[PDB]
Design a protein around this ligand. Sequence first.
Ligand code: ANP
Ligand code: D7O
Length: 344
Amino acid sequence: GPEMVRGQVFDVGPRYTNLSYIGEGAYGMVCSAYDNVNKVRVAIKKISPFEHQTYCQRTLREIKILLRFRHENIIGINDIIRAPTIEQMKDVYIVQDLMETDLYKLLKTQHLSNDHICYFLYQILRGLKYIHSANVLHRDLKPSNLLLNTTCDLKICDFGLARVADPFLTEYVATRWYRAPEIMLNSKGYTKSIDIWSVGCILAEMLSNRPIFPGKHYLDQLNHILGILGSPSQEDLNCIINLKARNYLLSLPHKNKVPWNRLFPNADSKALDLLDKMLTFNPHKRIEVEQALAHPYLEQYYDPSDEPIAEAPFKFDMELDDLPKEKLKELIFEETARFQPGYR
Ligand SMILES: Nc1ncnc2c1ncn2[C@@H]1O[C@H](COP(=O)(O)OP(=O)(O)NP(=O)(O)O)[C@@H](O)[C@H]1O
Ligand SMILES: *[C@@H]1[C@H](C(=O)OC(C)(C)C)C(=O)[C@@H]2C[C@@]1(C(=O)OC)CC2=C
């Protein structure tokens, strides 16, 4: 019989058993389980995306990217379970290595020492160097997408919003607190710099255990950023390619910059120097991932020879942005066929 968890069907036996609830999101539920074949503990994500185009988009992107990436600081996909016909397929189960918690959950129970902050930040950036080396933008970095274990290993997860870097997207996004200003302003938002901004927001949150820019709505989000960075400079304005957005910024009152050492009076000055370089409004002036790894704050961990890169750029082999959900379901079926007995 199909194991049920909190009233929900988890049709994953007989290979995967002893399921325990972990959490849930907008269209799924995550459980730990035991893989009786490989004799290891796993996480199993039940996803039910097919009634919504944006949920299918996230599912297909996550599957395609995570099956191609291979890196210690990025979560893998071990297995994918789904029905043997497309008409029967209503759920997809993604099996991944089991991690113990995520940074969102950790920060609610614990303040982090400077040494924990430094090591987590290093692993985030080490994972991100590989992503960017593959010409990929993660686009949804945030504490809940950083998985942790008892050994303090960190893995980036959830590539549902990821896309190829390439200097109006219909998509499902849970929070904008970590989104770079050029995205909020709709100006050439397919730059690797948008991920560095998110990492800066994560670093700020580790330093204080509070999100730095917790906007209540779209406009309030921009006001949070400007209220700390201050009104943009002339050169800042000139890097906004969207004249409507430039016009909007010009109508706002002048705001003074808040010193980093005022917001974070008890933080290591090297962390604040790095933070300042990640939370730079102009994306062309924002620090790049390799330069961030090389910053004196991370000097005890920096090791280029042990910070590997992708063998080649990732490519989608097809444009997925505006496909109908029925097409996306066919693509998800085809992408998961390799995990079926009898594939090709
Ligand atoms: N491999 C894993 N091991 C352990 N827990 C996991 C794993 N993957 C996800 N989780 C947890 O499962 C729960 C559901 O997460 P999920 O619904 O996928 O959202 P998310 O992609 O991590 N980001 P968010 O949209 O803010 O919740 C969270 O409590 C995660 O920490
Ligand atoms: C961190 C570690 C610890 O509890 O870290 C979390 C909360 C699990 C992330 C701990 O108890 C000490 C200090 C240490 C650390 O500074 O790692 C960089 C390692 C430990 C054994």
